[PDB]
């Protein structure tokens, strides 16, 4: 069940060793020293406007992108009451206010808002019903087949899969947090 | 106060999301479908050889181990008249009969026998005197300080702290039940 999940993911997808890129992180984000976790600060840091940095979206990326193959990583979201995670195109508009995070705008993400509302960030947003709140989420990228999927990485249940896409840009792991709370997002070691 | 215990656990220790590993579970144990609970059976299962499995001790482990950091989880023991819980080293002699569960053998555990006799499984065993019987037990690991502690998770009260170890191996949550009875051991998910 969980076991079947682990066997399936290990057979089919390459483990990506994701580390967060402080240079991309909106100034309201604190990336941990080990670059595995990200937290939202109360006050923004005073950081330069280098082209890589998100200036509007409360986002940070992985250091490395994907251009082909099947890849997965897992993110511990624990009890944090707001988070959205997935992948985004390298050429997302990092410097424009109010760009909706949607596949059309180079984002493939899902998560949680207001403690209990699960969504996939489609346009319009898709509401999800998950019998069990995930503590750890498996993100899955099949670049060739154009498929971004999410699983509960502990009990192996399927969370969501985006419609078929035809990727024309490299894809980054992306992480977004809006609220001030205690629990971090953490990229966990993967089998 | 339970309030102080709540604040303390939440400030200092990362909440471990513990799921029982059925491949480790001695064949006389039955792990629930959600792998949050374990019960002792009257008859063993007939299973294929597995290196991970406890052959002698009536034990099951968590799926994940700890190699650094401060971690806690909380176990519902209910009115069950016999149980022992804690952590053990990854390299405990799983396959060997008659190994005493003690710190020298890779185990740091405490619990209940015969309804009313609480013990820490030191060598010798140290008898505990608990003003009230717990129904939920908080297990606390601080890997750097070598500190394994047990608390009454409802009212915050201290149950037992082992002499500080110098851990040189990854640590698993471990769970042992000997006796036949209706109340399972249950891991309460992250609050
Ligand atoms: C302010 C902000 C994001 C909120 O965006 P939205 O208000 O469009 O809502 P959502 O559906 O969650 O994307 C910065 O990332
Ligand atoms: C039979 C058994 C465990 C009990 O071992 P022991 O009989 O040595 O007693 P204890 O002091 O509770 O460890 C299988 O796990």
Curated annotation (Swiss-Prot), chains A, B:
<comment type="function">
    <text>Plays a role in T-cell responses in the adaptive immune response.</text>
</comment>
<comment type="subunit">
    <text>Homodimer.</text>
</comment>
<feature type="domain" description="B30.2/SPRY">
    <location>
        <begin position="4"/>
        <end position="191"/>
    </location>
</feature>
<protein>
    <recommendedName>
        <fullName>Butyrophilin subfamily 3 member A3</fullName>
    </recommendedName>
</protein>
<comment type="similarity">
    <text>Belongs to the immunoglobulin superfamily. BTN/MOG family.</text>
</comment>
């Amino acid at each position: 069940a969980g076991a079947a999940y682990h066997e399936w993911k290990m057979a089919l997808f390459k483990p990506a060793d994701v580390i967060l890129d402080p240079d991309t992180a909106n100034a309201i984000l604190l990336v941990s020293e080990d670059q595995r976790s990200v937290q939202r600060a109360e006050e923004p840091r005073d950081l330069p406007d280098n082209p890589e940095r998100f200036e509007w979206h409360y986002c940070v990326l992985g250091c490395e992108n994907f251009t082909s193959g099947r890849h997965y990583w897992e993110v511990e979201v624990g009890d944090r009451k707001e988070w959205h995670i997935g992948v985004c195109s390298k050429n997302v508009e990092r410097k424009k206010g109010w760009v909706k995070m949607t596949p059309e705008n180079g984002y493939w993400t899902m998560g949680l808002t207001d403690g209990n509302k699960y969504r996939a960030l489609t346009e319009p947003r898709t509401n999800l019903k998950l019998p069990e709140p995930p503590r750890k989420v498996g993100i899955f990228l099949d670049y060739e087949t154009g498929e971004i999927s999410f699983y509960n990485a502990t009990d192996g249940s399927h969370i969501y899969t985006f419609p078929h896409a035809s990727f024309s840009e490299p894809l980054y792991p992306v992480f977004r947090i809006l609220t001030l709370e205690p629990t971090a997002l953490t990229i966990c070691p993967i089998p």
